[PDB]
């Protein structure tokens, strides 16, 4: 269910450039303190989409508080700024497939697709 998650865990969204010109971008959706979705967009490359469970080995293992993301001015973004790019890159089908195959850890994002 979406509201019970919502009403207990703040959903927070971040984007930062990769270190060395055009930069690649690292996007994240934190479901409370722990990452739920990760998206990596490099110039002239296909997107990398990552969801908790299936892609744990490629995803941030730190608690949000530990990352320093909340203390980097300009890193935090609107939910919709993440969502629009996630959806444009095929993130809905990606997560849905992960759910279907029983590879996705239940998060706010999967609750969003339970609709």
């Amino acid at each position: 269910r979406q509201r019970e998650i919502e009403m207990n865990r703040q959903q927070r969204f971040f984007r930062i450039p990769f270190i060395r010109k055009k930069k690649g971008w690292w996007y994240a959706h934190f479901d409370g303190p722990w990452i739920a979705r990760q998206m990596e967009l490099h110039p002239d490359k296909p997107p990398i989409l990552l969801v908790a469970g299936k892609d744990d080995m490629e995803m941030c293992e730190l608690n949000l508080e530990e990352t320093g993301l909340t203390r980097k001015r300009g890193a935090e973004i609107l939910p919709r700024q993440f969502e629009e790019i996630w959806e444009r890159c095929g993130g809905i089908q990606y997560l849905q497939n992960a759910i279907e195959s029983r590879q996705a850890r239940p998060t706010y994002a999967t609750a969003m697709l339970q609709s």
Partner: peptide, 27 residues
């Protein structure tokens, strides 16, 4: 403690490398 933010930095650097195996859109 900012060892953890160092850790986040190292993490980002390895992720940044994870795309060099991907094909270019241009060719």
């Amino acid at each position: 403690g900012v060892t953890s933010e160092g850790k986040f930095d190292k993490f980002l650097e390895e992720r940044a490398k994870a795309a060099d195996r991907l094909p270019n859109l241009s060719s």
